[PDB]
Structure 1
Amino acid sequence: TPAFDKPKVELHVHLDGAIKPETILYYGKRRGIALPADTPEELLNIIGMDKPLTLPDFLAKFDYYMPAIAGCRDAIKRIAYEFVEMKAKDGVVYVEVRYSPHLLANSKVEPIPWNQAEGDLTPDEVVSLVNQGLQEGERDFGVKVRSILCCMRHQPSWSSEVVELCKKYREQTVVAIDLAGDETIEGSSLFPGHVQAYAEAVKSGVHRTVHAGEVGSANVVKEAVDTLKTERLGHGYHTLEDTTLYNRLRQENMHFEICPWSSYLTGAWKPDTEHAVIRFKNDQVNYSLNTDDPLIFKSTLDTDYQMTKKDMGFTEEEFKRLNINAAKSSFLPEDEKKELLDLLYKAYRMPS
């Protein structure tokens, strides 16, 4: 059936967003945590969307399941492992994954999340667990895997330890710091703890991406690049509203992590426009195709490719070249970035 049946690269996908219905169900039962459904099957439907509802009623889908996973060291490690496998089920030969370590902890964590009581799992223990899972999975399913730690926009308090963890687990799958959460929160990009983290990132060699431009002004993107010094951009769509910045970005070779099917469902793209992306295609821009949250959008990486192919006339020749940009823009050490490309060129029938 496949849209693009060749080696792919993925840079923008959320761990909390990519969990198996069956193992949520399993951990619910075990822990005695109540759940809207009982079949692994019809549970996907209560958590999953098909109509393009919006960002309010989307963040509500997390409350359904997250309580069952968080605070359970056994689960953290398992969902990590099970994830690597689902990417190997798609074409994916290299992935970077992002999650908030604080959102899975139940101890030493500012507001304890998801309504759970204290508290044994520290956010450090978490990253460790997640790593052990990703490493076991790289080995067992043969996809190269590195991770990305998230700061939350409404919680600039946390972003201090987020970058500190990033530094200590550098030797183990963590390669970059992100910043998801809520964009349309007043002057968030400027919050003190947030900017000082990204400062330490630059000062310490820790690569940087930022969720910015999804549903929000081209100024959110501006602050991401200028004050925050991002190397890549989560989504970036409403940057086609400031041609000076847009064209100075293509100039400086900015990478755009793009989620086609996510856009439709979050409401960030309205169907009566040409997608943000089709512009990027004609404009020869540095960009990648991702998925964000497969569980909640009920998708596999193929849906984002099947969409781009069908809905907007993408061709294999384009697909090849954006997967190349992806690897080029990836946050791997140079030498391994080289061998990734080597692997890509070869399976695309290109040289060295």
Structure 2
Amino acid sequence: TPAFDKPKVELHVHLDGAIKPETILYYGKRRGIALPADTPEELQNIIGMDKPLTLPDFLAKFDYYMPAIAGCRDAIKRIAYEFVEMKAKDGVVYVEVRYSPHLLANSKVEPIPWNQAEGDLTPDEVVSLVNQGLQEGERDFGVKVRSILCCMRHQPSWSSEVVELCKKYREQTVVAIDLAGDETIEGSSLFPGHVQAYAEAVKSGVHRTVHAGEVGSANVVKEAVDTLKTERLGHGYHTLEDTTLYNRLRQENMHFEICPWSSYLTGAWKPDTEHAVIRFKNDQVNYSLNTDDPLIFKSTLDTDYQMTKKDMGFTEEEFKRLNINAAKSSFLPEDEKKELLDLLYKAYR
């Protein structure tokens, strides 16, 4: 089946969205939380979706499961490990995984997320754990994994912690800072907390990417580029609204992290229209193919090499164009990006 049986690069996938039903059932059972169901396969079909939903409809999915993972040191380290394992199945050679350390903790964070009482798991040692399982999976599974820490739009207060986390843990996997989600809250991009944390990123040489243009206007993409100084765009679909900002990102050539299957189950793209990616194809844009959230969207990388091969005419030459672009625009040190380019060029010819 797989549309592309070659190795892949993936840049845009969220850790708290690539958990296996099994492990949630497992920690929820052995901590008390009680899911909506007790078998592995009926949790999936109510925690995963298959028709566009709404934000609210969408954020409840996390309130099923996140209480049974957060908090527990053991779980935090497990999902990282198991994340690397399931990516190897996808045929990924290099993958950048993103997540918010605060949302996985139940102390030193205000407010405490998901609904949990206080404890002693702090954002700082949450990322250290994740770091562990990630490096553990890498050498157990043969997939190169780096980390991305996410700032939360609605909580500029956590932003300055994230940059520090990114700098303290640089080398230990984490390679950049991110922004999401819900980019429709007014002027979130210009939240002082956010912009000055991104300013710290630039000062300290931390790579930068931003969720922009997925469900927001072309102006959110703008302030991400000109203010937050992003090097990559998360989605960046709506920059088709402003043709001069588009031609200018053609020309700077910026990376768009496309998520095709995500964009339908969210509503970002309506079916009875261009998909933003066909245009990036025809126009030779720098872009990638990515999964976003394999748990919530019942999918694997192969569901969206498939959707593009099948409903939109991608052939395998663009498939491989797009994975060498993804490798180029990776947040990898100049030497390592170059050993990864070497592997792929030879694997593809």
TM-score (norm 2): 0.99
Give the superposition deviation at 1:22: 0.3
**Cα distance in 2 for residues equivalent to 1:230 and 1:291:** 21
Give the superposition deviation at 1:274: 1.3
Give the superposition deviation at 1:56: 2.6
**Cα distance in 1 for residues equivalent to 2:266 and 2:317:** 29
Give the superposition deviation at 1:264: 0.6
Matches of residues 1-352 of structure 1 in structure 2 within 5 Å?
1-349=1-349
Q: Indicate conservation of the 8 Å contact 1:112/1:118, yes or no.
A: yes
Q: Indicate conservation of the 8 Å contact 1:6/1:91, yes or no.
A: yes
**Cα distance in 2 for residues equivalent to 1:167 and 1:188:** 23
**SS of 1:31 mapped into structure 2:** coil
Encode CA deviations 1:55-91: one digit per residue, 9 max, x unaligned: 2311111100000000000000000000000000011
**SS of 1:16 mapped into structure 2:** helix
**Cα distance in 2 for residues equivalent to 1:135 and 1:241:** 41
Encode CA deviations 1:173-204: one digit per residue, 9 max, x unaligned: 00000001110000111111100100000000
Encode CA deviations 1:11-56: one digit per residue, 9 max, x unaligned: 0000000000000000001101121010011110010111122323
Give the superposition deviation at 1:267: 0.6
**Cα distance in 1 for residues equivalent to 2:319 and 2:8:** 9
**Cα distance in 2 for residues equivalent to 1:17 and 1:78:** 14
**Cα distance in 2 for residues equivalent to 1:284 and 1:51:** 30
**SS of 1:146 mapped into structure 2:** strand
**Cα distance in 1 for residues equivalent to 2:232 and 2:318:** 20
Q: Indicate conservation of the 8 Å contact 1:73/1:126, yes or no.
A: yes
**Cα distance in 2 for residues equivalent to 1:30 and 1:87:** 26
**SS of 1:196 mapped into structure 2:** helix
**Cα distance in 2 for residues equivalent to 1:303 and 1:267:** 17
Encode CA deviations 1:102-121: one digit per residue, 9 max, x unaligned: 00110000100000000110
**SS of 1:225 mapped into structure 2:** helix
**SS of 1:164 mapped into structure 2:** helix
Encode CA deviations 1:232-270: one digit per residue, 9 max, x unaligned: 000000110000000011111110000000001011100
Encode CA deviations 1:149-176: one digit per residue, 9 max, x unaligned: 0000000000000000100000200000
Give the superposition deviation at 1:339: 0.4
Give the superposition deviation at 1:131: 0.2
Q: Indicate conservation of the 8 Å contact 1:291/1:301, yes or no.
A: yes
**SS of 2:30 mapped into structure 1:** helix
Aligned length: 349
**SS of 2:110 mapped into structure 1:** coil
**SS of 1:140 mapped into structure 2:** helix
Q: Indicate conservation of the 8 Å contact 1:55/1:267, yes or no.
A: no
**Cα distance in 1 for residues equivalent to 2:108 and 2:239:** 38
Q: Indicate conservation of the 8 Å contact 1:147/1:173, yes or no.
A: yes
The alignment-based identity, stated in percent, is 100
Q: Indicate conservation of the 8 Å contact 1:231/1:254, yes or no.
A: yes
Give the superposition deviation at 1:281: 0.2
**SS of 1:60 mapped into structure 2:** helix
**Cα distance in 2 for residues equivalent to 1:346 and 1:54:** 43
TM-score (norm 1): 0.99
**SS of 1:239 mapped into structure 2:** helix
Give the superposition deviation at 1:280: 0.2
**Cα distance in 2 for residues equivalent to 1:46 and 1:189:** 32
Q: Indicate conservation of the 8 Å contact 1:54/1:265, yes or no.
A: no
Give the superposition deviation at 1:311: 0.6
**Cα distance in 2 for residues equivalent to 1:297 and 1:152:** 21
**Cα distance in 2 for residues equivalent to 1:108 and 1:72:** 15
**Cα distance in 2 for residues equivalent to 1:7 and 1:134:** 19
**Cα distance in 2 for residues equivalent to 1:279 and 1:196:** 34
**SS of 2:4 mapped into structure 1:** coil
**Cα distance in 1 for residues equivalent to 2:216 and 2:140:** 40
Which runs of 5 or more residues in structure 2 are unaligned?
none
Which runs of 5 or more residues in structure 1 are unaligned?
none
Give the superposition deviation at 1:140: 0.3
Q: Indicate conservation of the 8 Å contact 1:10/1:92, yes or no.
A: yes
**Cα distance in 1 for residues equivalent to 2:55 and 2:243:** 27
**Cα distance in 2 for residues equivalent to 1:288 and 1:47:** 26
**Cα distance in 1 for residues equivalent to 2:30 and 2:270:** 41
**Cα distance in 2 for residues equivalent to 1:48 and 1:107:** 28
Q: Indicate conservation of the 8 Å contact 1:278/1:312, yes or no.
A: yes
**Aligned Cα root-mean-square deviation (Å):** 0.5
